[PDB]
Amino acid sequence: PGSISLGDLHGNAIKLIHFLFRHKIIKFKTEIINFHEAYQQFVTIYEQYDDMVQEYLEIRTLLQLIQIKITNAQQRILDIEQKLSLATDHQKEFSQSLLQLKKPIEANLQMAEKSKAGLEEKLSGLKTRLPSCIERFNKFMTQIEINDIKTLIRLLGDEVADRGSCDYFTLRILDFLYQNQIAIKIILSNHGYEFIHAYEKLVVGQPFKPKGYIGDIQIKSFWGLQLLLEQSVITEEELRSLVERAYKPTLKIIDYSLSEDGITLYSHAPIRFDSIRMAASQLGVTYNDSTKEALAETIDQLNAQLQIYMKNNMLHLLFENNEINDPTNMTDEERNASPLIYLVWNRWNESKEVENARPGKYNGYFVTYVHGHDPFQSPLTYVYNLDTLCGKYSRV
Amino acid sequence: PGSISLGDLHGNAIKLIHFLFRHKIIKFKTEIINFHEAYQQFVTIYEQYDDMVQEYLEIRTLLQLIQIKITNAQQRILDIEQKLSLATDHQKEFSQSLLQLKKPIEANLQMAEKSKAGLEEKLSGLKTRLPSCIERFNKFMTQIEINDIKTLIRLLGDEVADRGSCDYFTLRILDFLYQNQIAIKIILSNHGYEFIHAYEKLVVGQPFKPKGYIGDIQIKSFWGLQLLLEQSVITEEELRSLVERAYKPTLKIIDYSLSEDGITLYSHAPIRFDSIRMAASQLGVTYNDSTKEALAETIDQLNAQLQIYMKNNMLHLLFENNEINDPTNMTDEERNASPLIYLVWNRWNESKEVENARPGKYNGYFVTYVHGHDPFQSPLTYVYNLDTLCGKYSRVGEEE
Ligand SMILES: [Br-]
Ligand SMILES: [Br-]
Ligand SMILES: [Br-]
Ligand SMILES: [Br-]
Ligand SMILES: [Br-]
Ligand SMILES: [Br-]
Ligand SMILES: [Mn+2]
Ligand SMILES: [Mn+2]
Ligand SMILES: [Mn+2]
Ligand SMILES: [Mn+2]
């Protein structure tokens, strides 16, 4: 009834596969003879898909730029055409000048349209290659079976919408775990938020587009999924199924585990202990931590509120603050105003390693902190900064 | 005919006034003494107004930021209220949480409104101070008279919409010269364009707002004029009267004078000789430089075409190119595509100082180049980069 936590994913489905193999959660079926050959198949699929998404991102950028060029040229042509139409009978040099001024704009517009068509054809070429990639991924997934079912898997965040190749692979792996009754919890993260932002727009009839605070290269794995949806390689029905059953139910603002005499607090970013009380304040949850069980119950109630916001497609209401200058170093006022932003964006440093930030004993119970990768290394023996593919076990 | 040229004005009416005194174009009337005390009164007005426009720029920026806060908060509130429907379907617990979310946004909206109102109050206080300043300027303009009417005045550009206090002062001084039959030519410039862009919009009933490529601090003197217009201290009718009679007719793409054996080319930016044919190509002007007279006639035709664009409120058609990355360092392609932008934005540097860029003799005639101040110093004796320290008169033998 223990758990293993993974703090280093960055939207990279190979890293999830690596973690699941190395901790004996999954294994190849008996029929597979060559482990390294079978595993290298996914590495190759993943790399080829990564290259296709890179190609897509460059096409996306060029298409956006060319559409600005086309719209500008069209507006300028229309303006000159109105001036010519409104001309007086004594404006022959005026009309002659404007007629010849319009020609280079028309030529630029034709060149931009031709360029746009070529980029659309390149995108069409990508679409013809995408099914082959997915079919090879599907064949790989049929070679896998569950091994250990008794261990809770915890992902500390940035599992989607990050620097890897494709959130579809990751969602499919989460759904494989769901179909095999594996207990899994995922901490809400700053990259996870970009994904959820896009998904809850999609299901209300807005574009499946991220918030866009994080740049496209740093949410590449979202674009790897969106490419499949926009090119009709996967159905919106399947995306909704994966997200609704295998992803959203796992999400926690904060997770915990209880020992005989202590609590362990799992967060995405490194966080002060008192940020939990601030999160309770924003969400209308009564905060109590007099005992480890009371703090556990407080956190349960925070996570129930998260599920209410997500079920209503309104998580974005808790993640909007246009006055924060640096979400990795939020001021006292900013932390109080937007505690969930702090919980997913904070980065530790020496000035934050102070007395009372993260006590190791509190109200007579021990407190252990486990969070996702962060550059700063705290010397506190009860702070675990998971910047490795190796999992952290919870003990007896 | 002789001329004087000013290459460093930067929207500063004091610099213009000093230039006109220094070269004996104007003088105080004999009833004024002491002369120093009268000039110093205009200096005080100008500096007083300069500080006022600085205050105005600070208010403008703060108001623009506050309007962003206000609009953001209003959208979020309206968003939440729309989600607060309906009460019935036991979203009650959830209604409560959304109501609590709304409270800090409403508090931030109210705070931003109070700040906006106090800034609009500050602007109102500024407004009450403006009339006296214009009154003192008007008194000063009654104290001067024309002196030399036989010298052509050439402004090499950035005469308006630049770093000084107020384009109204400058336009009134231009009108004074116009009223006294002074010949004036002004070279079209990058700050000049910001002014004209706004003025052309005003003429056709659009807001008196600049293109906005140049930052507000660097077009301060436009804002000092716009402050008078928007606060109803001067009329739209007066402003247009001044611009139509005393400013727009003087404008040139490039100007020239002819000597017995050469041509002198006056520009705002330092420019390559081959920029002239590029300007001709965009304007549909037949280009001919086989003789200095043919080149002079080409430039005359460029300037006639400029006046068509000016008269029809459409100069913006020649100054729009969203593809240029650095207007001060345009590529060959960019120069061919937008030659007038090149003519007003180019900044020279060592890489541009090459043998055929600006030849001193061409097709049998000498070529001399005169342009507004530019930091790079070319060691060509026939290139005149008119920092304020350089002599302003035309060289011997040039006939303007
Ligand atoms: Br006309
Ligand atoms: Br889509
Ligand atoms: Br902190
Ligand atoms: Br001077
Ligand atoms: Br106005
Ligand atoms: Br050049
Ligand atoms: Mn993160
Ligand atoms: Mn480590
Ligand atoms: Mn200068
Ligand atoms: Mn300039």
Residue numbers in the entry:
A (entry chain A): 23 to 418
B (entry chain B): 23 to 422
From the paper:
Here we describe the crystal structure and biochemical properties of WipA (or IcmW-interacting protein A; lpg2718), an effector protein originally identified because of its dependence on the IcmSW complex for translocation, but for which the function is unknown. The crystal structure reveals a two-domain structure comprising a metallophosphoesterase attached to an 85-Å-long α-helical hairpin forming a coiled-coil at its tip. Although WipA exhibits a serine/threonine phosphatase fold, it functions preferentially as a protein-tyrosine phosphatase (PTP), even though there are no structural similarities to the general PTP fold. The protein forms homodimers in solution, and the dimer is mediated by the tip of the helical hairpin domain.
Subsequently, a larger fragment, from residue 24 to residue 435 (termed “WipA435”) was produced containing a more complete active site. WipA435 crystallized in the presence of MnCl2 and crystals diffracted to a resolution of 1.75 Å. The WipA435 structure was determined by molecular replacement using the WipA411 structure as a search model. The model of WipA435 contains residues 24–418 in one molecule and residues 24–422 in the other. The two protomers of WipA435 superimpose with each other with an RMSD value of 0.72 Å, suggesting identical structures. The second interface is observed only in the WipA435 crystals and involves a disulfide bridge from Cys412 and a Mn2+ ion coordinating two Asp409 residues from symmetrically related molecules. A difference anomalous Fourier map revealed the presence of four Mn2+ ions: one in each molecule refined to full occupancy that appear strongly bound, two (one at the interface between two WipA molecules, and one in chain B in the proximity of the active site) appearing to be weakly bound. The strongly bound ions locate within proximity of three sequence motifs (DXH, GDXXDR, and GNHE) known to be signature motifs for metallophosphoesterases, suggesting that these ions (one in each protomer) might be catalytic ions and that the residues around them might form the active site. All three sequences in the structure locate in one region of the structure, suggesting that the active site of WipA is located there. This region indeed comprises the one fully occupied Mn2+ cation described above in a tetrahedral bipyramidal arrangement coordinated by the WipA residues Asp180, His290 (a residue outside the phosphatase motifs), and Asn212, two water molecules, and a phosphate ion. The fact that we do not observe Mn2+ bound to His32 might be due to an incomplete structure lacking a large part of the C terminus of the full-length protein. This is consistent with WipA435 being inactive in the phosphatase assay (data not shown).
